[PDB]
Symmetry: C3
C-alpha cells in the first residue's frame, strides 16, 4: 500500500518548535505546555521507532489489525500535537507542517486498517477509521477545519473518502464542500450540543454576515468555558480535549470558506482570526 | 462483562492533585516527584486511549490474553500512582478516590484475564496476583489501603478474584472484618519482614508489640545504603508499598488501640488511621 | 534459551547516574539532557515491568515474534541511554556497566528473535537482529566501538555471531580484529558517507591518517545547520552514535599509537581511550 506520512523526518523539526518566540493564543501555563509537548513528541518518536511503524506490512490477519490500531493511536497523538501547537501560538506555516503529517497519519492508519480487514476477510469491527457519529467527531472536525484554516484543503477529499468513509453530517459537509465539490449537505447533526445551534446559520443565514455566528461563539464557547470544570462535565456539550479543545475551529473555518467580514467574531477568545488571515493570504 | 473502572473520568482530576497545598508525608524531592507523577498519569492516559481499553471485548483467544496483560500493567501503574500520592501528602479523601480506581483496575484486569482464558478454552494458570511471589506488595497495598481508606467493601471481591483466595496470615488479618473471617492462615509467604509480626499475632492486641517491628523492619532497614538494602532478604515493593508500614497502620484501624507508641515512626500512617476511624464513625 | 540481561537490577542504579559530579563531554543543555534521560529510563522501566519481559518464553509463534520486536526496541533504548551517558560525561567504569546491559539486551533480543523464528517454522523477515547494510549501522558501530573503548571486547564475538550474523563490512571487521582475528577483513563499505573516507587509512603506525577524517567528517559536518546536514546525505545515528567519532577513538585503542593530533577534536573520546588502555593494562 502507498503510505504518505514522513513522520521520522518531521520529528526533529517539531521537537525544535518548543523554542518559539511567539505568544500563546490563550492563557496557558508554559511549564505544563512544554512538558505536554515533550510527552507527545516522545510518544510519536517511540511509535516511529516501533517495528509496526517501520515494517507495517510484516503482519497478517489479526496481527495486522493490532498494528493498525497502534497507527490510529499515533494519528490521535499527532492531532493532539497540532492542538498543543495552536495553543502555543505557532504561526500558520509551522502549524501546516504539523497538519500535513497529522492528515497523512490518519490516512495511512485508515489504509492499514482497510488492508487488515481485507486480510481477515480473505482468511474467512466495521466502523470507519474515524467514526464521526461517536465521540471521535472532534478529530474529524479538526481534520476538516484545520485543512481549511491551514490552506491544505486538497487533502480533505481522501480524508473524507478513506478515513470517514463519507459518514459526514451537515457541519462536516459544509467544511468540506469546496474541497469535494459538494452541491448539497446532509440534514443530520451527529452531536446537537453544540452543533445544532448552527441550524439558524445553515438554513436562514445569508453568508453575508458573520453576525449569524456571534451568539454561537458567546453561548457555546465563552459561556461554556466560563462554567466550572465539574459543571462543564455535567452538560451534554461534546468536548474534544485531544483535538478541538478551546477553539471554535468550525466558526473560524467557515470564515475562510465564506469570505465575509469576520470583525464581530474576532472579539471572541475562541476564534482563530490569525489563521483566517493566514489561509486567505496563502490561498491569495 | 461489566467493567468497574472509570479511569478516563478520573485522569483530569488526578492531574489537579499535583497542585495540592499539602506537605509530603516524608522527605521527598518535589521536582522528581512531579516528574514521576506526570509519567504515571501519561502512561495511564495512553492506556485509556488504547483500543484494548476502549474496546476490551473486541479481541479473542491469544489476542484477548495479550490485552489482559496490558490491563494488568495499567493496574500496577495505578498502584504506583496511589503510592506516589501517599508520599506527596494527599489527604484521605483524595487517596480514597485514587484507591477506588486502583482496585477497580485490578478487578477489571482479573476479570479480563479470566475471560481470555475462557476464550482460549472455547477455541481448544497464575492468578492476577500471586502473593507467594514478589507480587505480594501489590496484594498488601490493595488490602491495607482498603482498610486505611475506609473502602473495605472492596476487599472480598479482591481476595476472591484477584488473589483467588491465596492469602497468608497477614493478608487474612487485614481482610478478617470484611470477609467475616473468624480464623487465619498459619503461613507467612515472606518471612522477611512479615515473620517479625509473630509476637503481635500470637499475643493478639497491644500496639507495643508492633513498636520493635517498625524499628527493625522499617527505620533500621531504610537507614542502610541502597546497595546494602538489596543484599538483605527483606521483601521490598517500590511499585506499591515503598516506605510505608501499611500493614501496621491498617492493624491500628482494625484493632482500635491507642497507637501513640507507633506514631513516632516516620513509616506509620497516623493521619490515615485517623481518617479511616473518623469515616467509619 | 538463557537470557543474560539484568535490566531490572540496573535501572535504580542508572537513574542515580543523573546525580553525577562529572562535567559533560560536549556542550549540552543539562535540563534537556535530564528530561531525555528520564524518558529513556521510564521506557526501560515500563519494558522491565511488561509481561513480555517478565515471562519471555510464554508466548509462542507470531506472539513470540511480536515479543522479540519489543526486546529489540528496548535494546535500542539501552543503546540511546549509553549515548546520553557518554554526552553527560559519565566516566569509563559507569559507561561500562551500562554497556554490559546494552550488549546483553541486544544478545537477548537476537536469541528471542531466533527462537520465535524457530517456533514459527516448527509450526509449519529473515534479516538479522541488526542489519548493518541498512540505517541500523550506527547501533553496530556503537556495539563494537564501545566494546573496545570500554575494555569489554569479550562481548564482541557473541555480538558479531548472534546480533550481526557475521554481516560486517571493513570498518566493523577492523573494530573486531583483536577479538576475532584479521584474516580476510571485508573489502566492502556499507555507508560511503562518512566511512568511505577511511579508505586511505585502511589501504595506505600514525594517527595523522585520521586527522582530516575528523575535521571533514565530524567537525565540518556538525558545524552545519540541521537543514544543511541533511543535504550532505551523510549517515547519522542520533540513537546510538551521535556526535562521537567512536570508530576513530576505538582504533586508537586497537592500534596503540600516539593519538595527540586527534585529541584536538571535540569529537574524539580520549578519556575513554585512556580508560580502556589503563584497564587493559
Amino acid at each position: 500500500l502507498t503510505l504518505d506520512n514522513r513522520l521520522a523526518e518531521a520529528l526533529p523539526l517539531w521537537r525544535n518548535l518548543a523554542r518559539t518566540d511567539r505568544a500563546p493564543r490563550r492563557n496557558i501555563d508554559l511549564a505544563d505546555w512544554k512538558a505536554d509537548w515533550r510527552e507527545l513528541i516522545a510518544a510519536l518518536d517511540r511509535f516511529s521507532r516501533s517495528h509496526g511503524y517501520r515494517q507495517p506490512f510484516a503482519a497478517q490477519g489479526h496481527a495486522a489489525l493490532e498494528n493498525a490500531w497502534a497507527w490510529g493511536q499515533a494519528a490521535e497523538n499527532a492531532s493532539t500535537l497540532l492542538l498543543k501547537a495552536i495553543d502555543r501560538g505557532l504561526a500558520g506555516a509551522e502549524l501546516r507542517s504539523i497538519y500535513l503529517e497529522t492528515a497523512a497519519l490518519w490516512l495511512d492508519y485508515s489504509r492499514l486498517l482497510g488492508a487488515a480487514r481485507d486480510s481477515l476477510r480473505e482468511q474467512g469491527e466495521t466502523a470507519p477509521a474515524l467514526a464521526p457519529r461517536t465521540g471521535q467527531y472532534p478529530f474529524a472536525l479538526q481534520l476538516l477545519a484545520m485543512g481549511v484554516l491551514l490552506d491544505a484543503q486538497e487533502l480533505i477529499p481522501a480524508l473524507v473518502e478513506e478515513v470517514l468513509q463519507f459518514d459526514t453530517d451537515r457541519l462536516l459537509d459544509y467544511l468540506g464542500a469546496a474541497a469535494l465539490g459538494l452541491t448539497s449537505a446532509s440534514e443530520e447533526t451527529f452531536h446537537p450540543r453544540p452543533f445544532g445551534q448552527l441550524r439558524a446559520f445553515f438554513e436562514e443565514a445569508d453568508g453575508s454576515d458573520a453576525q449569524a455566528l456571534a451568539p454561537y461563539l458567546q453561548s457555546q464557547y465563552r459561556e461554556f468555558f466560563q462554567l466550572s470544570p465539574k459543571a462543564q462535565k455535567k452538560t451534554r456539550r461534546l468536548t474534544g480535549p485531544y483535538a478541538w479543545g478551546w477553539w471554535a475551529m468550525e466558526v473560524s473555518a467557515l470564515g475562510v470558506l465564506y469570505g465575509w467580514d469576520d470583525g464581530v467574531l474576532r472579539a471572541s477568545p475562541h476564534y482563530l482570526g490569525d489563521l483566517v488571515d493566514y489561509a486567505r493570504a496563502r490561498g491569495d
